[PDB]
Write a protein that binds this ligand. Structure first.
Ligand SMILES: [Mg+2]
Ligand SMILES: [Mg+2]
Ligand SMILES: [Mg+2]
Ligand SMILES: [Mg+2]
Ligand SMILES: [Mg+2]
Ligand SMILES: [Mg+2]
Ligand SMILES: [Mg+2]
Ligand SMILES: [Mg+2]
Ligand SMILES: [Mg+2]
Ligand SMILES: [Mg+2]
Ligand SMILES: [Mg+2]
Ligand SMILES: [Mg+2]
Ligand SMILES: [Mg+2]
Ligand SMILES: [Mg+2]
Ligand SMILES: [Mg+2]
Ligand SMILES: [Mg+2]
Ligand SMILES: [Mg+2]
Ligand SMILES: [Mg+2]
Ligand SMILES: [Mg+2]
Ligand SMILES: [Mg+2]
Ligand SMILES: [Mg+2]
Ligand SMILES: [Mg+2]
Ligand SMILES: [Mg+2]
Ligand SMILES: [Mg+2]
Ligand SMILES: [Mg+2]
Ligand SMILES: [Mg+2]
Ligand SMILES: [Mg+2]
Ligand SMILES: [Mg+2]
Ligand SMILES: [Mg+2]
Ligand SMILES: [Mg+2]
Ligand SMILES: [Mg+2]
Ligand SMILES: [Mg+2]
Ligand SMILES: [Mg+2]
Ligand SMILES: [Mg+2]
Ligand SMILES: [Mg+2]
Ligand SMILES: [Mg+2]
Ligand SMILES: [Mg+2]
Ligand SMILES: [Mg+2]
Ligand SMILES: [Mg+2]
Ligand SMILES: [Mg+2]
Ligand SMILES: [Mg+2]
Ligand SMILES: [Mg+2]
Ligand SMILES: [Mg+2]
Ligand SMILES: [Mg+2]
Ligand SMILES: [Mg+2]
Ligand SMILES: [Mg+2]
Ligand SMILES: [Mg+2]
Ligand SMILES: [Mg+2]
Ligand SMILES: [Mg+2]
Ligand SMILES: [Mg+2]
Ligand SMILES: [Mg+2]
Ligand SMILES: [Mg+2]
Ligand SMILES: [Mg+2]
Ligand SMILES: [Mg+2]
Ligand SMILES: [Mg+2]
Ligand SMILES: [Mg+2]
Ligand SMILES: [Mg+2]
Ligand SMILES: [Mg+2]
Ligand SMILES: [Mg+2]
Ligand SMILES: [Mg+2]
Ligand SMILES: [Mg+2]
Ligand SMILES: [Mg+2]
Ligand SMILES: [Mg+2]
Ligand SMILES: [Mg+2]
Ligand SMILES: [Mg+2]
Ligand SMILES: [Mg+2]
Ligand SMILES: [Mg+2]
Ligand SMILES: [Mg+2]
Ligand SMILES: [Mg+2]
Ligand SMILES: [Mg+2]
Ligand SMILES: [Mg+2]
Ligand SMILES: [Mg+2]
Ligand SMILES: [Zn+2]
Lengths: 105, 48, 47, 112
RNA sequence: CCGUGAGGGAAAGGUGAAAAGAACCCCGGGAGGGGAGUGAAAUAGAGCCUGAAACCGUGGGCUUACAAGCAGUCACGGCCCCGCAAGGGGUUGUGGCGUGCCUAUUGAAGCAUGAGCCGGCGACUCACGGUCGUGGGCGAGCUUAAGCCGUUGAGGCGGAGG
RNA sequence: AGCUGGGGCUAGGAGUGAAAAGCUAACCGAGCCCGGAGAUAGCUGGUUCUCCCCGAAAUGACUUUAGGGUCAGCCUCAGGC
RNA sequence: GGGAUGACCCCAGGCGGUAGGGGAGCGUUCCCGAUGCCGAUGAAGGCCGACCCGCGAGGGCGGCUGGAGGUAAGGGAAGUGCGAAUGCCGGCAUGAGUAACGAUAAAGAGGGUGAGAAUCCCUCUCGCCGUAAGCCCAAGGGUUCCUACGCAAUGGUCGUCA
């Protein structure tokens, strides 16, 4: 039911935090946490036990989810926009009110 | 019947009761062959 | 010494039982109240 | 440099175990080693464990040179007490508390 | 959970922005801990925000084994501490003085009630009438009720009646 | 006029009782639960920050009144003389 | 009286106090002030202070902690101040390492297992039940049965056993 803005296809900008400034592609999107994970932005170090693979290994780097609010869709040519919705026929859209463009895939 | 204490006894008075409660360390002698320590007139844990 | 609970499974279903309660208006109202309070068990559990 | 060990939630009474802790305070690690072995108290076991871990921790972690270790300071604080019901005459039921000790041995280096 | 049953009826919320919830190594049977590592912060480590008090404990300063007491207060002195000193903080040897709090009673230190100690909960209110006082509006007058209209938490109308 | 298992019936001013006001689910001269209910209590207890001023009574009359009250007396505040 | 119509100097007096009457203030929660102001260069809360203001209730300031809130001047409204109620809920003391550890049928040794054994396993000896303390059945109980891996708790000690 939760509406988001960005989806898996998207290229987004991380607009805040340690990773502020960087653009990348949302690798996964978790509506129920209101979180997107953008590979490869937000990386962290998890320690991991010696069972098979990481059978020797003690440390993994993984990319942490981000509050879906922290990121913005890039809009080809810019780094703004928000949302707009064009209808035409029969239905559907995303446009940049920045303006006016894709997503799409 | 059924005697009871009349006053909670003070932190001062219970601690002073305990002035004798302190332990004294075990009585120990060096062992005839091995390096180790033993209570006197006993059979040494090492090299009896 | 002989005490007050001498469990017998027939006596229990015959006395506090569900069909018991339902036979008498006194007892339908027992069930009504228990149901309204939202009791999990409306009536004693005998095996 | 100085090194410690803390045994936590040891099921034994602070009053009881404090007594043996007093036996080995300011002792060279070697006399402390001998005192607890021949002490007869359930708490000589538990202290000896904490003694060692601190001795281990000293050489093995903080690079302390074992032969000069003494017991700088040490003590048992009182952990959270588990309560149980002790049924009694005429229906009565007191509660007795099985208690808890936090044992702490703190080691430092002799100056010789 | 208690009760045969009708029925009674609790406690118990909070790591971090994010699990990044501590791989590995050391003592250990384990629990627990010490290094490592994460983290802005780990006495935020999961018995996890803040973390009071009673209560227990370790270290330090002053002190006490020929004094006797509601435990304090006045004074001088010794020791320790902060400093610019004539200064101030701590402690307390000797000397003066000194019958706990509350309640209830003509009278309580009272050998009369209540209280082990700490934290939190805990008792003169509201409505409509009445009566005085007071701050204002209008004054031979003053004043609307139900309701009607309107309203970003906008007010006005309404004179039955009193 | 025996003891006993199992199955039944009788109950709250009611039952039952070789009779003690015994027993009726560990307190029966009238069971327990929930409710009228925050019954009533002329009685006992308790009543929570600070400073300033003033400052009583424990008597009289009536009282199914006597450790409760109503009026008077004595306190206090405002205005007046 | 000072004539400043005063917030103020001078002079003169009064100021023990329970039931009570009266008056001025402090503080707590909340609202208007507020689309503001304080705040991560650190809010509320906490811990200290020998410092400053107030007669006092209180208010400041400073340091430490804490880490996301607070809320002036002026005014408004209350679930507004606790030491006592054999009060209520919780927490922690004292008695105290004290009484007990629940049938006086009774134990000893060797060996095994295990980090750890008076308490588990085996052997041997000893003791106690035997119209029972043995064995069957009915209630009632409800997986307690069997076996493997366990010992935080439960077991009035211990436990490797249950
Ligand atoms: Mg019989
Ligand atoms: Mg019972
Ligand atoms: Mg049957
Ligand atoms: Mg259900
Ligand atoms: Mg007993
Ligand atoms: Mg019993
Ligand atoms: Mg107790
Ligand atoms: Mg039941
Ligand atoms: Mg959080
Ligand atoms: Mg740590
Ligand atoms: Mg802290
Ligand atoms: Mg913290
Ligand atoms: Mg805690
Ligand atoms: Mg927080
Ligand atoms: Mg904490
Ligand atoms: Mg000390
Ligand atoms: Mg003499
Ligand atoms: Mg002397
Ligand atoms: Mg004196
Ligand atoms: Mg009292
Ligand atoms: Mg009295
Ligand atoms: Mg009297
Ligand atoms: Mg009298
Ligand atoms: Mg007395
Ligand atoms: Mg008396
Ligand atoms: Mg008294
Ligand atoms: Mg209190
Ligand atoms: Mg009124
Ligand atoms: Mg009025
Ligand atoms: Mg008027
Ligand atoms: Mg309308
Ligand atoms: Mg029969
Ligand atoms: Mg029957
Ligand atoms: Mg029968
Ligand atoms: Mg019947
Ligand atoms: Mg009758
Ligand atoms: Mg008979
Ligand atoms: Mg009953
Ligand atoms: Mg009876
Ligand atoms: Mg009756
Ligand atoms: Mg009656
Ligand atoms: Mg009524
Ligand atoms: Mg009442
Ligand atoms: Mg009556
Ligand atoms: Mg009453
Ligand atoms: Mg009359
Ligand atoms: Mg009376
Ligand atoms: Mg009168
Ligand atoms: Mg004067
Ligand atoms: Mg006065
Ligand atoms: Mg006077
Ligand atoms: Mg910061
Ligand atoms: Mg607040
Ligand atoms: Mg602060
Ligand atoms: Mg405010
Ligand atoms: Mg105000
Ligand atoms: Mg209140
Ligand atoms: Mg009081
Ligand atoms: Mg004694
Ligand atoms: Mg004795
Ligand atoms: Mg004994
Ligand atoms: Mg015995
Ligand atoms: Mg072996
Ligand atoms: Mg072995
Ligand atoms: Mg025989
Ligand atoms: Mg069966
Ligand atoms: Mg059972
Ligand atoms: Mg089971
Ligand atoms: Mg079995
Ligand atoms: Mg087994
Ligand atoms: Mg166990
Ligand atoms: Mg045990
Ligand atoms: Zn554009």
């Amino acid at each position: 039911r939760v509406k988001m803005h960005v989806k898996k296809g998207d290229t987004v900008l991380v607009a805040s935090g340690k990773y502020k400034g960087r653009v990348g592609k949302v690798k996964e999107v978790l509506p129920k946490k209101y979180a997107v994970i953008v590979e490869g932005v937000n990386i962290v170090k998890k320690a991991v036990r010696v069972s098979p693979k990481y059978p020797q290994g003690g440390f993994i780097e993984k990319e942490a989810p981000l509050h879906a609010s922290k990121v913005r869709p890039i809009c080809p040519a810019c780094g703004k926009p928000t949302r707009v919705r064009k209808k035409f026929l029969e239905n559907g859209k995303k446009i940049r009110v920045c303006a006016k463009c894709g997503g799409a895939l | 019947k059924h005697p009871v204490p009349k006053k909670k006894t003070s932190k001062a008075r219970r601690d002073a009761r305990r002035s004798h409660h302190a332990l004294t360390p075990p009585t120990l002698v060096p062992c005839p062959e091995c390096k180790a320590m033993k209570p006197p007139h006993t059979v040494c844990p090492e090299c009896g | 010494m002989k005490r007050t609970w001498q469990p017998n499974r027939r006596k229990r279903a015959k006395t506090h039982g569900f069909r018991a309660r339902m036979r008498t208006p006194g007892g339908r109202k027992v069930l009504k109240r228990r149901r309204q309070k939202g009791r999990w068990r409306l009536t004693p559990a005998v095996r | 440099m100085e090194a410690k060990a803390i045994a936590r939630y040891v099921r034994i009474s602070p009053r009881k175990v404090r007594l043996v802790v007093d036996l080995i305070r300011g002792k060279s690690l070697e006399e402390a080693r001998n005192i607890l072995r021949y002490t007869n108290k359930r708490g000589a076991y538990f202290v000896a464990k904490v003694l060692e871990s601190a001795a281990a921790n000293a050489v093995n972690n903080h690079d302390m040179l074992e032969d000069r270790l003494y017991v700088k300071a040490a003590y048992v604080d009182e952990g959270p007490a588990l309560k149980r019901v002790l049924p009694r005459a005429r229906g009565r039921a007191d509660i007795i508390k099985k208690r808890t000790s936090h044992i702490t041995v703190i080691l430092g280096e002799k100056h010789g």
